[PDB]
Amino acid sequence: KFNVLSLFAPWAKMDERNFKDQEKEDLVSITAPKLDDGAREFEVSSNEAASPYNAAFQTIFGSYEPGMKTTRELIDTYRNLMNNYEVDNAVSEIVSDAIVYEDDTEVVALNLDKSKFSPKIKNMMLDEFS
Amino acid sequence: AEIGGDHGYNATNIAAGQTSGAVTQIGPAVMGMVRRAIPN
Amino acid sequence: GPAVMGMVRRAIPNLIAFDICGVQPMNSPTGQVFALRAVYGKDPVAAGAKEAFHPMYGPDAMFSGQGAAKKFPALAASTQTTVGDIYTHFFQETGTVYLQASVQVTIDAGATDAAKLDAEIKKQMEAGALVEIAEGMATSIAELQEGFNGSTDNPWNEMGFRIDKQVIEAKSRQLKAAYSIELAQDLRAVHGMDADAELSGILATEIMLEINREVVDWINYSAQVGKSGMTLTPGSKAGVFDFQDPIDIRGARWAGESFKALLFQIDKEAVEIARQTGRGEGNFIIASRNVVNVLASVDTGISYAAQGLATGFSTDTTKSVFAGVLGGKYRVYIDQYAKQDYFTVGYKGPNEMDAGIYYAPYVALTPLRGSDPKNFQPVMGFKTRYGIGINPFAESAAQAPASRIQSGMPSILNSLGKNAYFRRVYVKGI
């Protein structure tokens, strides 16, 4: 392709490298998706003399888009639940406990107490983290 | 002197494994197959 | 529920499976088997080509020998021999034989068929007129083979082989139940039946029974008839063994000594089978329940005489069909559906391709289900596909098939009454 979306050209290169690493892996003889959570997988099956991925394409296109629609209904609801009493505070209390931050306290902080190439890197990593 | 002989270029005989000699064949090994590409 | 007294149904008979035949599991339809036939005479595939090895024929004892230099006169009806010469004849059985003439005599001028000529020649052999003979070639001839020193027409006899084959195809069979809802519902209310499952059972059962029955029939169909030819007692009834006729029992009376006569013939038939196939003495018999009842009641071991109850081998056809092992040598099965009374014997080797008769399943008992919306009544059924075949060389009479290719499936022409691996015996007089 010509990478029309030049916007992500450097990111595309990062994905190409990772994708190539997977192509070079011995992760074969696997019937399972090898997935647990996150991104929605589907049978875009290609690089073989059957081309079933076309059905997969048409499914995503023709049915656009109950995945995100449901997601909206859920999120919109989530916000509407938070809008009421008690739910409001339960969220606040949880958020506050998850991230507690006060005068001169510690923030989430990278603790590099395990082996590293060099203490110099440990400082670089912490500076980047900040 | 026994011979192998050969096929008559008759795809039927070839597929069957028939030749003019002393020994029949199993049949042609299959090298693979090609499915017409799908239009974009 | 006016004192329901339970219910009855028929039991399902057992099967001999494929214990005595090839099983060839397949992963594709239409498989193939090929074979090599050692052959000589400079053209492996030709009319008149001669095979180097065969269970029923003697070798050409003078092929690499004196026959290389000269032809021998053939024996023929009405001709006269010359004392000291050597004549050739290929017999219908026992094959190539070279006979030196001890006398100057003629051979059955009235003979017609080869069978008649062979018979007279055999008599002349018994008589000492014709004697088996072979010799190598004078060395002074051998010396110039391949045209040396100006000589001609002196090639060495040559050998080679011909590879050819046979193929099979799977035929199939299917049945449906076509039953009703209302009946099934009533049955649930009478015996607690599912009335689909019972039908499933019936259909699958029938299919399996048919197949196994078909194999047995093919065994009977292709088997050669025993108490014939080389296994025949000349004063006998040709193919049938009696108890009411002293010829088959060497004058026996007294069952303890009489019944053993059958065992004797069985061995003879089993041995001839080895003679026919070149593999080994028959190792299995299937027979009518009446035959087995006799076998199970006689001491089959070697002893003075002995008789008792039929306890030696299971005799029922209600638990099994396998009676046991005869003398520790042959697997005895019961032909639970024998049409008359008899028994077939045969040999099956450790090599699945060494059996004479082969079963080769590809698809089996696939269930099918649905319903017809016009009345919504259920439809259920099952499908099987397999194919069977026969051993190349099962006929044995012919050294080779036409066109280097043949169906491996049985047919009348291919195998009725011809199969080297099995022999039939008719039984009467029990």
Coordinates of C-alpha atoms in Angstrom, one line a residue:
Chain A
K1 CA 0.0 0.0 0.0
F2 CA 1.0 3.7 -0.1
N3 CA 0.2 4.4 3.5
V4 CA -2.2 7.2 2.7
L5 CA -2.7 7.8 6.4
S6 CA 0.9 9.2 6.8
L7 CA -0.4 10.2 10.3
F8 CA 0.8 6.9 11.7
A9 CA 3.7 6.1 9.5
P10 CA 6.2 5.5 12.5
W11 CA 3.6 3.5 14.3
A12 CA 3.0 1.3 11.3
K13 CA 6.7 0.5 11.3
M14 CA 6.4 -0.5 14.9
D15 CA 3.5 -2.8 14.1
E16 CA 5.3 -4.3 11.1
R17 CA 8.2 -5.3 13.3
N18 CA 6.0 -7.0 15.9
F19 CA 4.0 -8.7 13.2
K20 CA 7.1 -10.0 11.5
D21 CA 8.3 -11.3 14.9
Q22 CA 5.0 -13.3 15.1
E23 CA 5.4 -14.6 11.6
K24 CA 8.8 -16.0 12.7
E25 CA 7.4 -17.7 15.8
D26 CA 6.7 -21.5 16.1
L27 CA 3.2 -20.9 17.5
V28 CA 1.6 -23.3 15.2
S29 CA -0.7 -26.4 15.7
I30 CA -2.9 -24.1 17.7
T31 CA -6.7 -24.4 17.3
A32 CA -7.5 -21.8 20.0
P33 CA -7.5 -18.0 19.2
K34 CA -4.8 -17.7 22.0
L35 CA -6.8 -14.8 23.3
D36 CA -8.3 -13.8 26.7
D37 CA -9.6 -10.3 26.5
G38 CA -9.5 -6.9 24.8
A39 CA -9.7 -6.4 21.0
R40 CA -12.5 -8.3 19.1
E41 CA -11.3 -11.1 17.0
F42 CA -12.9 -12.6 13.9
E43 CA -12.2 -15.1 11.0
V44 CA -10.6 -12.9 8.4
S45 CA -9.2 -16.1 6.9
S46 CA -6.8 -15.6 4.0
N47 CA -3.5 -16.4 2.4
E48 CA -5.1 -19.6 1.2
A49 CA -7.1 -20.9 -1.8
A50 CA -10.6 -20.4 -0.4
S51 CA -10.6 -16.7 0.6
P52 CA -13.3 -17.0 3.4
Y53 CA -12.2 -13.6 4.8
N54 CA -14.5 -12.0 2.2
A55 CA -17.5 -13.2 4.4
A56 CA -15.7 -11.8 7.4
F57 CA -15.3 -8.4 5.6
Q58 CA -18.9 -8.3 4.5
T59 CA -20.0 -9.2 8.0
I60 CA -18.2 -6.3 9.6
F61 CA -19.3 -3.9 6.8
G62 CA -22.9 -5.1 6.3
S63 CA -23.6 -5.2 10.0
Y64 CA -21.9 -2.0 11.0
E65 CA -21.9 -1.7 14.1
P66 CA -23.6 -3.4 17.0
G67 CA -20.3 -3.8 18.8
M68 CA -19.8 -0.1 19.3
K69 CA -23.5 0.5 19.5
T70 CA -23.8 -1.8 22.5
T71 CA -20.7 -0.2 23.9
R72 CA -22.4 3.2 23.7
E73 CA -25.5 1.9 25.3
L74 CA -23.5 0.5 28.2
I75 CA -21.3 3.6 28.6
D76 CA -24.2 6.0 28.4
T77 CA -25.9 3.9 31.0
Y78 CA -22.7 3.8 33.1
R79 CA -22.7 7.6 33.1
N80 CA -26.4 7.7 33.9
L81 CA -25.9 5.3 36.8
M82 CA -23.1 7.5 38.1
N83 CA -25.4 10.5 37.9
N84 CA -27.6 9.2 40.8
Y85 CA -26.9 9.2 44.5
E86 CA -24.7 6.6 46.2
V87 CA -23.5 5.4 42.8
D88 CA -21.9 8.8 42.6
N89 CA -20.0 8.4 45.8
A90 CA -19.1 4.8 45.3
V91 CA -17.3 5.7 42.2
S92 CA -15.7 8.7 43.8
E93 CA -14.5 6.7 46.8
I94 CA -13.1 4.0 44.7
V95 CA -11.3 6.4 42.4
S96 CA -9.9 8.3 45.3
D97 CA -8.6 5.1 46.9
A98 CA -7.1 3.9 43.6
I99 CA -5.3 7.2 43.3
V100 CA -4.6 8.9 46.5
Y101 CA -2.8 12.2 46.1
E102 CA -2.2 14.9 48.7
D103 CA 0.3 17.5 49.7
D104 CA 3.8 16.2 49.3
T105 CA 2.8 12.6 48.8
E106 CA 4.0 9.9 46.4
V107 CA 2.3 9.5 43.0
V108 CA 2.2 6.3 41.1
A109 CA 5.9 5.6 40.8
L110 CA 8.1 3.2 38.9
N111 CA 10.0 1.1 41.4
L112 CA 13.0 -0.3 39.6
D113 CA 14.4 -2.5 42.4
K114 CA 15.1 -5.4 40.1
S115 CA 18.2 -6.0 38.0
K116 CA 18.9 -3.6 35.1
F117 CA 21.7 -2.9 32.6
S118 CA 22.8 0.1 34.6
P119 CA 21.7 2.6 37.4
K120 CA 22.0 5.2 34.6
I121 CA 19.1 3.5 32.9
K122 CA 17.2 3.3 36.1
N123 CA 17.4 7.1 36.3
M124 CA 16.5 7.5 32.6
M125 CA 13.4 5.3 33.0
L126 CA 12.3 7.1 36.1
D127 CA 12.7 10.5 34.3
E128 CA 10.7 9.3 31.3
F129 CA 8.1 7.8 33.7
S130 CA 7.8 11.3 35.3
Chain B
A1 CA 15.3 -57.2 -21.9
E2 CA 12.2 -56.0 -20.0
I3 CA 11.3 -52.3 -20.5
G4 CA 9.3 -49.5 -18.9
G5 CA 7.6 -48.4 -22.1
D6 CA 5.7 -45.2 -21.8
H7 CA 2.4 -43.3 -21.8
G8 CA 0.6 -42.5 -25.0
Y9 CA 0.1 -38.8 -23.9
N10 CA -3.5 -39.8 -23.3
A11 CA -4.3 -38.1 -20.1
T12 CA -6.8 -40.9 -19.2
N13 CA -4.1 -43.5 -19.5
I14 CA -1.7 -41.3 -17.7
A15 CA -4.0 -40.8 -14.8
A16 CA -4.8 -44.5 -14.7
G17 CA -1.1 -45.3 -14.8
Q18 CA -1.1 -47.3 -18.0
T19 CA 2.1 -47.6 -20.1
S20 CA 3.3 -49.8 -22.9
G21 CA 5.8 -51.6 -20.8
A22 CA 6.0 -54.3 -18.2
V23 CA 5.0 -52.1 -15.2
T24 CA 1.9 -50.1 -14.5
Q25 CA 2.1 -47.0 -12.4
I26 CA 0.3 -46.0 -9.3
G27 CA -0.8 -42.8 -11.0
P28 CA 0.7 -39.4 -11.2
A29 CA 1.8 -37.7 -8.0
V30 CA -0.1 -34.6 -7.4
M31 CA 2.0 -31.5 -7.2
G32 CA -0.7 -29.2 -5.8
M33 CA -3.7 -27.2 -7.0
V34 CA -4.7 -23.7 -8.1
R35 CA -8.0 -22.1 -7.3
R36 CA -8.9 -19.1 -9.5
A37 CA -8.3 -15.8 -7.6
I38 CA -11.3 -13.9 -6.2
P39 CA -12.2 -10.5 -7.8
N40 CA -11.8 -7.4 -5.7
Chain C
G1 CA -52.7 -50.1 33.8
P2 CA -54.7 -53.4 34.0
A3 CA -51.8 -55.5 35.4
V4 CA -49.3 -54.9 32.6
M5 CA -47.2 -58.1 32.3
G6 CA -44.1 -56.4 30.9
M7 CA -43.1 -56.8 27.3
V8 CA -41.0 -58.8 24.9
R9 CA -39.0 -58.2 21.8
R10 CA -36.4 -60.2 19.8
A11 CA -32.8 -60.3 20.6
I12 CA -30.2 -59.2 18.2
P13 CA -27.9 -62.0 16.7
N14 CA -24.2 -61.5 16.9
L15 CA -21.7 -61.2 14.0
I16 CA -18.4 -62.7 12.9
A17 CA -17.1 -59.3 12.2
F18 CA -14.2 -59.3 9.9
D19 CA -12.3 -61.9 11.9
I20 CA -11.6 -63.9 8.9
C21 CA -11.1 -61.3 6.2
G22 CA -9.1 -58.2 5.3
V23 CA -10.3 -55.0 7.0
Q24 CA -8.4 -52.2 5.0
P25 CA -9.7 -49.1 6.8
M26 CA -9.8 -46.4 4.2
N27 CA -9.4 -42.7 4.3
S28 CA -10.6 -42.3 0.8
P29 CA -13.0 -44.1 -1.6
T30 CA -11.7 -46.2 -4.5
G31 CA -8.4 -47.6 -3.2
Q32 CA -5.9 -49.7 -5.2
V33 CA -3.6 -52.7 -4.8
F34 CA -0.9 -53.8 -7.2
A35 CA 1.2 -56.9 -7.6
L36 CA 4.4 -58.3 -9.1
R37 CA 4.3 -61.5 -11.2
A38 CA 7.7 -63.0 -11.8
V39 CA 7.6 -63.9 -15.5
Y40 CA 9.8 -65.4 -18.2
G41 CA 10.1 -65.8 -22.0
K42 CA 11.4 -62.2 -22.9
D43 CA 8.1 -60.5 -22.7
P44 CA 6.5 -60.0 -19.3
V45 CA 3.2 -59.1 -20.8
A46 CA 2.1 -61.4 -23.5
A47 CA -0.2 -64.2 -24.4
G48 CA 1.4 -67.4 -23.3
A49 CA 3.8 -65.6 -20.9
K50 CA 5.0 -67.9 -18.1
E51 CA 5.1 -67.1 -14.4
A52 CA 8.2 -68.1 -12.5
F53 CA 6.3 -69.0 -9.4
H54 CA 2.9 -70.5 -8.8
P55 CA 1.4 -72.7 -6.0
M56 CA -0.3 -75.0 -8.4
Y57 CA 2.2 -75.4 -11.1
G58 CA 5.6 -77.0 -11.3
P59 CA 8.5 -74.9 -12.6
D60 CA 9.9 -75.4 -16.0
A61 CA 12.7 -77.7 -14.9
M62 CA 14.6 -77.3 -18.2
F63 CA 14.1 -73.6 -18.9
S64 CA 17.7 -72.5 -17.9
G65 CA 18.8 -76.0 -18.9
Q66 CA 18.5 -78.2 -22.1
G67 CA 15.3 -76.5 -23.2
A68 CA 17.4 -73.5 -24.0
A69 CA 18.9 -75.4 -26.9
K70 CA 16.0 -77.4 -28.2
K71 CA 12.3 -77.6 -28.2
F72 CA 10.7 -80.8 -26.9
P73 CA 7.9 -82.5 -28.8
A74 CA 4.6 -82.0 -27.1
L75 CA 2.4 -84.8 -26.0
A76 CA -0.9 -84.8 -27.8
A77 CA -3.8 -87.1 -28.2
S78 CA -3.2 -90.0 -30.6
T79 CA 0.5 -89.4 -31.0
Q80 CA 3.0 -92.2 -30.4
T81 CA 6.1 -91.8 -28.3
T82 CA 9.7 -92.8 -29.1
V83 CA 11.5 -94.6 -26.4
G84 CA 14.2 -92.4 -24.9
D85 CA 12.9 -89.2 -26.1
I86 CA 11.4 -86.5 -23.9
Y87 CA 8.0 -85.0 -24.3
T88 CA 6.5 -81.9 -22.9
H89 CA 3.1 -81.3 -21.5
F90 CA 1.5 -78.5 -19.5
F91 CA -1.1 -80.0 -17.3
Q92 CA -4.3 -78.1 -16.2
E93 CA -2.9 -78.6 -12.6
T94 CA 0.7 -79.5 -11.7
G95 CA 1.9 -77.4 -14.7
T96 CA 5.0 -78.0 -16.7
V97 CA 6.2 -81.5 -16.9
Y98 CA 8.9 -83.1 -19.0
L99 CA 8.4 -86.9 -19.5
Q100 CA 10.9 -89.3 -20.9
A101 CA 9.4 -92.2 -22.8
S102 CA 10.3 -95.6 -21.5
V103 CA 8.1 -97.1 -24.2
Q104 CA 6.8 -96.5 -27.8
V105 CA 3.1 -96.0 -27.1
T106 CA 0.1 -93.9 -28.1
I107 CA -1.9 -91.7 -25.9
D108 CA -5.7 -91.8 -25.9
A109 CA -6.5 -91.1 -29.6
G110 CA -10.1 -90.6 -28.5
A111 CA -9.2 -87.8 -26.1
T112 CA -10.8 -84.5 -26.7
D113 CA -10.6 -81.9 -23.9
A114 CA -7.2 -81.3 -22.3
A115 CA -8.7 -82.9 -19.2
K116 CA -9.0 -86.2 -21.0
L117 CA -5.5 -86.0 -22.3
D118 CA -4.1 -85.1 -18.9
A119 CA -5.9 -88.1 -17.4
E120 CA -4.3 -90.5 -19.9
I121 CA -0.9 -89.0 -19.5
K122 CA -1.3 -89.4 -15.7
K123 CA -2.1 -93.0 -16.3
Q124 CA 0.9 -93.5 -18.5
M125 CA 3.0 -91.9 -15.8
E126 CA 1.6 -94.2 -13.1
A127 CA 2.2 -97.1 -15.5
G128 CA 5.8 -96.2 -15.8
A129 CA 5.5 -95.3 -19.5
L130 CA 6.2 -91.6 -18.9
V131 CA 8.7 -90.5 -16.3
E132 CA 9.5 -87.0 -15.0
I133 CA 12.9 -85.8 -16.2
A134 CA 15.1 -82.7 -16.4
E135 CA 18.7 -82.0 -17.3
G136 CA 21.0 -79.0 -17.9
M137 CA 22.3 -78.0 -21.3
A138 CA 25.3 -79.6 -22.9
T139 CA 28.2 -77.3 -22.2
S140 CA 29.4 -77.5 -25.7
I141 CA 26.3 -75.6 -26.6
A142 CA 26.5 -73.2 -23.8
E143 CA 30.0 -72.4 -24.8
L144 CA 28.9 -70.4 -27.9
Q145 CA 25.7 -68.8 -26.6
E146 CA 25.3 -65.2 -27.9
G147 CA 26.7 -66.0 -31.4
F148 CA 30.3 -66.9 -30.5
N149 CA 32.7 -68.4 -33.1
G150 CA 30.3 -67.9 -36.0
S151 CA 27.3 -69.6 -34.3
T152 CA 23.7 -68.4 -34.6
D153 CA 20.3 -68.6 -32.9
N154 CA 21.7 -69.3 -29.4
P155 CA 20.4 -66.6 -27.0
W156 CA 20.1 -67.4 -23.3
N157 CA 16.6 -67.7 -21.9
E158 CA 15.5 -64.6 -20.1
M159 CA 13.4 -63.6 -17.2
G160 CA 11.8 -60.5 -15.8
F161 CA 8.4 -59.6 -14.3
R162 CA 5.2 -57.8 -14.9
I163 CA 3.5 -55.3 -12.5
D164 CA -0.1 -54.8 -12.8
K165 CA -3.0 -53.9 -10.7
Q166 CA -6.6 -53.9 -9.6
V167 CA -8.9 -51.3 -8.2
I168 CA -12.0 -51.1 -6.1
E169 CA -15.0 -48.8 -5.6
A170 CA -17.4 -48.3 -2.6
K171 CA -21.0 -49.1 -2.9
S172 CA -23.4 -47.8 -0.2
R173 CA -26.6 -48.5 1.7
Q174 CA -29.1 -46.4 3.6
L175 CA -32.3 -46.7 5.5
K176 CA -34.9 -44.5 7.1
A177 CA -37.5 -45.0 9.8
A178 CA -40.2 -42.5 8.6
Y179 CA -42.1 -42.8 11.9
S180 CA -44.8 -40.7 13.6
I181 CA -45.2 -38.4 16.6
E182 CA -48.3 -39.9 17.9
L183 CA -46.9 -43.4 18.0
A184 CA -43.8 -42.2 19.8
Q185 CA -45.9 -40.4 22.3
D186 CA -48.0 -43.4 23.0
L187 CA -45.0 -45.6 23.4
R188 CA -43.6 -43.1 25.9
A189 CA -46.9 -43.7 27.8
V190 CA -46.8 -47.5 27.5
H191 CA -43.2 -48.6 28.0
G192 CA -41.4 -45.4 28.4
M193 CA -39.8 -45.8 25.0
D194 CA -38.1 -42.9 23.1
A195 CA -39.3 -44.5 19.9
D196 CA -36.7 -42.8 17.8
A197 CA -33.7 -44.3 19.6
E198 CA -35.2 -47.8 19.3
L199 CA -35.6 -47.2 15.6
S200 CA -32.1 -45.8 15.3
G201 CA -30.9 -49.1 16.9
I202 CA -33.0 -51.1 14.5
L203 CA -31.8 -49.4 11.4
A204 CA -28.1 -49.3 12.3
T205 CA -28.4 -52.9 13.4
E206 CA -29.9 -54.0 10.1
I207 CA -27.2 -52.4 8.1
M208 CA -24.5 -53.9 10.1
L209 CA -26.1 -57.3 9.9
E210 CA -26.5 -57.1 6.2
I211 CA -22.9 -56.2 5.7
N212 CA -21.6 -59.0 7.7
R213 CA -24.1 -61.4 6.1
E214 CA -22.9 -60.1 2.7
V215 CA -19.3 -60.9 3.5
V216 CA -20.2 -64.4 4.5
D217 CA -22.1 -64.9 1.3
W218 CA -19.2 -63.6 -0.7
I219 CA -17.1 -66.1 1.0
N220 CA -19.4 -68.9 0.0
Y221 CA -19.8 -67.4 -3.5
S222 CA -16.1 -67.2 -4.3
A223 CA -15.0 -70.4 -2.5
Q224 CA -13.9 -73.4 -4.6
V225 CA -15.8 -76.6 -4.0
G226 CA -13.9 -79.2 -1.9
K227 CA -13.9 -83.0 -2.0
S228 CA -13.0 -82.5 -5.5
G229 CA -9.9 -82.8 -7.7
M230 CA -6.9 -83.4 -5.5
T231 CA -9.0 -83.8 -2.4
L232 CA -11.5 -86.2 -3.9
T233 CA -12.0 -89.8 -2.9
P234 CA -12.9 -91.4 -6.3
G235 CA -15.8 -93.5 -5.0
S236 CA -17.3 -90.4 -3.3
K237 CA -20.3 -88.2 -4.1
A238 CA -18.3 -85.2 -5.3
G239 CA -18.3 -82.2 -2.9
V240 CA -20.5 -83.7 -0.2
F241 CA -19.6 -85.4 3.0
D242 CA -22.0 -88.0 4.4
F243 CA -22.3 -90.2 7.5
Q244 CA -24.7 -92.6 6.0
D245 CA -22.1 -93.5 3.3
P246 CA -19.1 -95.6 4.3
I247 CA -17.0 -94.2 1.6
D248 CA -16.5 -91.0 3.5
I249 CA -15.8 -92.6 6.8
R250 CA -13.6 -95.5 5.8
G251 CA -16.3 -98.0 6.9
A252 CA -16.9 -96.4 10.3
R253 CA -19.7 -97.2 12.6
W254 CA -19.6 -96.3 16.2
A255 CA -19.8 -92.4 16.3
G256 CA -16.7 -92.3 18.6
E257 CA -14.6 -93.4 15.6
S258 CA -17.0 -92.2 12.7
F259 CA -17.2 -88.6 13.5
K260 CA -13.5 -88.1 13.2
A261 CA -13.7 -88.7 9.5
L262 CA -14.9 -85.2 9.0
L263 CA -12.0 -83.8 10.8
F264 CA -9.7 -85.7 8.5
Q265 CA -11.4 -84.2 5.5
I266 CA -11.2 -80.8 7.0
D267 CA -7.5 -81.0 7.3
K268 CA -7.3 -82.2 3.7
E269 CA -9.3 -79.2 2.5
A270 CA -7.2 -76.8 4.6
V271 CA -4.0 -78.2 3.3
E272 CA -5.2 -77.9 -0.3
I273 CA -6.0 -74.3 0.3
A274 CA -2.3 -73.8 1.2
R275 CA -1.5 -75.6 -2.0
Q276 CA -3.8 -73.1 -3.8
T277 CA -2.6 -69.8 -2.2
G278 CA 1.0 -70.4 -1.4
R279 CA 0.6 -68.9 2.0
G280 CA -0.4 -71.5 4.7
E281 CA -2.9 -74.0 5.9
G282 CA -6.4 -72.7 6.3
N283 CA -6.9 -71.3 9.8
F284 CA -10.6 -70.8 10.0
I285 CA -13.9 -72.6 9.4
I286 CA -17.4 -71.4 9.4
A287 CA -20.1 -74.0 9.6
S288 CA -23.7 -74.8 10.2
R289 CA -24.8 -75.2 13.8
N290 CA -25.3 -78.9 13.1
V291 CA -21.7 -79.4 12.0
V292 CA -20.4 -77.6 15.0
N293 CA -22.6 -79.7 17.3
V294 CA -20.7 -82.7 15.9
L295 CA -17.3 -81.0 16.2
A296 CA -18.0 -80.1 19.9
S297 CA -19.0 -83.6 20.8
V298 CA -16.0 -85.5 19.3
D299 CA -12.6 -85.5 20.7
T300 CA -10.8 -83.7 18.0
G301 CA -7.4 -84.6 19.3
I302 CA -5.6 -87.8 18.3
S303 CA -7.0 -90.7 20.2
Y304 CA -8.4 -94.2 19.9
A305 CA -12.0 -93.1 19.7
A306 CA -14.2 -90.8 21.8
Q307 CA -17.7 -89.3 22.0
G308 CA -19.7 -87.2 24.5
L309 CA -21.8 -84.1 24.8
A310 CA -21.3 -81.1 22.7
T311 CA -19.2 -79.1 25.2
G312 CA -15.9 -78.7 23.2
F313 CA -16.9 -75.4 21.6
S314 CA -19.6 -72.9 22.3
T315 CA -22.5 -74.0 20.1
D316 CA -24.9 -71.2 20.6
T317 CA -25.7 -68.4 18.2
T318 CA -27.2 -66.4 21.0
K319 CA -24.2 -65.1 22.9
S320 CA -21.7 -65.4 20.1
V321 CA -21.1 -66.9 16.7
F322 CA -17.6 -67.8 17.5
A323 CA -17.5 -71.3 18.8
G324 CA -13.8 -71.6 19.6
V325 CA -10.6 -73.0 18.1
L326 CA -10.6 -76.4 16.5
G327 CA -7.7 -78.4 17.7
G328 CA -6.1 -75.2 18.8
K329 CA -5.6 -74.7 15.0
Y330 CA -8.7 -73.3 13.3
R331 CA -11.1 -70.4 14.3
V332 CA -14.6 -71.9 14.3
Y333 CA -17.6 -69.6 13.5
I334 CA -21.2 -70.7 13.2
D335 CA -23.2 -70.0 10.1
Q336 CA -26.3 -69.1 12.0
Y337 CA -28.2 -68.7 8.8
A338 CA -26.9 -71.6 6.8
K339 CA -29.4 -72.6 4.1
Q340 CA -28.8 -76.3 4.3
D341 CA -25.9 -77.8 6.2
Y342 CA -22.3 -77.5 5.3
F343 CA -19.0 -75.7 6.1
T344 CA -16.5 -73.4 4.4
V345 CA -12.8 -73.4 5.3
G346 CA -10.1 -71.0 4.5
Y347 CA -6.8 -69.1 5.4
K348 CA -6.2 -65.5 6.5
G349 CA -2.7 -64.3 7.2
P350 CA -1.3 -61.7 9.7
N351 CA -0.9 -59.4 6.7
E352 CA -4.1 -57.6 6.2
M353 CA -3.6 -57.8 2.4
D354 CA -3.2 -61.6 2.6
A355 CA -6.9 -62.7 2.9
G356 CA -8.5 -63.5 -0.4
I357 CA -11.5 -61.5 0.7
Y358 CA -11.3 -57.9 1.7
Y359 CA -13.6 -55.5 3.5
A360 CA -12.6 -51.8 3.2
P361 CA -14.9 -49.4 5.2
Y362 CA -14.8 -45.6 4.3
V363 CA -18.1 -44.2 5.6
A364 CA -20.2 -45.9 8.3
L365 CA -23.4 -45.5 10.1
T366 CA -23.8 -41.8 9.6
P367 CA -27.1 -40.8 11.3
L368 CA -29.4 -38.4 9.6
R369 CA -32.3 -36.4 11.2
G370 CA -35.0 -33.9 10.2
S371 CA -38.8 -33.6 9.8
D372 CA -41.2 -32.9 6.9
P373 CA -43.1 -29.6 7.6
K374 CA -46.1 -30.7 5.6
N375 CA -47.1 -32.7 8.7
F376 CA -44.0 -32.2 10.7
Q377 CA -43.5 -35.8 11.2
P378 CA -39.9 -36.8 11.9
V379 CA -37.5 -38.5 9.5
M380 CA -34.5 -40.3 10.7
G381 CA -32.0 -42.7 9.1
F382 CA -28.4 -44.0 8.6
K383 CA -25.9 -44.2 5.8
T384 CA -22.8 -46.5 5.1
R385 CA -20.3 -46.9 2.2
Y386 CA -17.4 -49.3 1.9
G387 CA -16.7 -51.6 -1.0
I388 CA -15.1 -55.0 -0.9
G389 CA -12.6 -56.8 -3.0
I390 CA -10.7 -59.8 -3.9
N391 CA -7.0 -60.8 -3.9
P392 CA -5.1 -60.5 -7.1
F393 CA -4.2 -64.1 -7.9
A394 CA -7.3 -65.4 -6.0
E395 CA -8.4 -67.3 -9.1
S396 CA -4.9 -68.8 -9.3
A397 CA -5.7 -70.7 -12.4
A398 CA -4.5 -67.8 -14.6
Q399 CA -1.0 -66.6 -14.3
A400 CA -2.2 -63.1 -15.2
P401 CA -5.2 -60.8 -16.0
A402 CA -6.2 -59.2 -19.3
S403 CA -5.0 -55.6 -20.1
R404 CA -2.8 -55.2 -17.0
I405 CA -5.8 -53.8 -15.1
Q406 CA -8.9 -55.1 -13.6
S407 CA -11.6 -54.5 -11.1
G408 CA -10.6 -55.8 -7.7
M409 CA -14.3 -56.2 -7.0
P410 CA -15.9 -59.7 -7.1
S411 CA -18.1 -60.6 -10.0
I412 CA -19.1 -63.9 -11.5
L413 CA -16.3 -63.8 -14.0
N414 CA -13.8 -62.7 -11.5
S415 CA -14.4 -65.1 -8.7
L416 CA -17.5 -67.3 -8.6
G417 CA -16.3 -70.7 -7.3
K418 CA -12.6 -69.7 -8.0
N419 CA -11.1 -68.2 -4.8
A420 CA -7.9 -70.0 -3.8
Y421 CA -8.3 -69.0 -0.1
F422 CA -11.5 -70.9 0.6
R423 CA -13.2 -74.3 -0.1
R424 CA -16.8 -75.4 0.3
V425 CA -18.1 -78.7 1.8
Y426 CA -21.7 -79.9 1.7
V427 CA -22.8 -81.8 4.7
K428 CA -25.5 -84.4 5.0
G429 CA -26.4 -87.4 7.2
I430 CA -25.9 -85.8 10.6

